[PDB]
Amino acid sequence: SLLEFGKMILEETGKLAIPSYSSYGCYCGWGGKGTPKDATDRCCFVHDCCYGNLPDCNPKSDRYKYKRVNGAIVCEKGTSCENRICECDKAAAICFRQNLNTYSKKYMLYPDFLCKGELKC
Ligand SMILES: O=C(O)CCCC[C@H]1[C@H]2NC(=O)N[C@H]2C[S@@]1=O
């Protein structure tokens, strides 16, 4: 759920999910079109695709459990939807961590008309 996800992103990156990753670029936050602006934006694009692999799941609201093993995120057993949502979220948080060196505040609040298409999952 948005709860596990936001706390997972803060743990990984030291950044608040809202607002650092909730209106960034073309894919981070509600909506999505066009070519991702940068690596962090591509993380969001892939996460959107990951959720799109799960049309009968409800990632905003379905809570999953995860733990830390040796600092690593480990998804714990739940429903199939919960396990798959957790893996999507885990990947996005790790992807955000891996691309902190190129995160750019200039992409916050990025305007929709500059999201010049197109990218298939
Ligand atoms: O907005 C947030 O909660 C921070 C995460 C970044 C945006 C991505 C992520 N956030 C979320 O709750 N689901 C997805 C939609 S985007 O891929």
Q: Which residues contact 85 (CB under 8 A, 6 or more apart)?
A: 51, 54, 57, 59, 62, 64
Q: Known catalytic residue: 41?
A: no
Asked whether the beta carbons of 36 and 119 are under 8 A apart, the reply is: yes
Way the structure was solved: X-ray
CA–CA distance from 107 to each of 17, 29, 61, 88, 89 (Å)? 14, 12, 27, 23, 21
Q: Is the peptide bond before 19 cis (omega within 30 degrees of 0)?
A: yes
69: three-class secondary structure by DSSP: strand
Quick one: tokens of 32? 């999505």
Rounded distance between C-alpha atoms, residue 40 and residue 22, angstroms: 12
Domain count, the chain: 1
Say yes or no: CB of residue 44 within 6 Å of ligand 1.
Answer: yes
- Is 31 annotated as belonging to a binding site? yes
13: CA distance to ligand 1 center in Å? 14
* Domain membership of residue 77 as a residue range: 1-121
Q: Which amino acid is at 80?
A: S
What resolution in Å is listed for this PDB structure? 1.1
Identify the CATH number of the domain in which residue 57 sits. 1.20.90.10
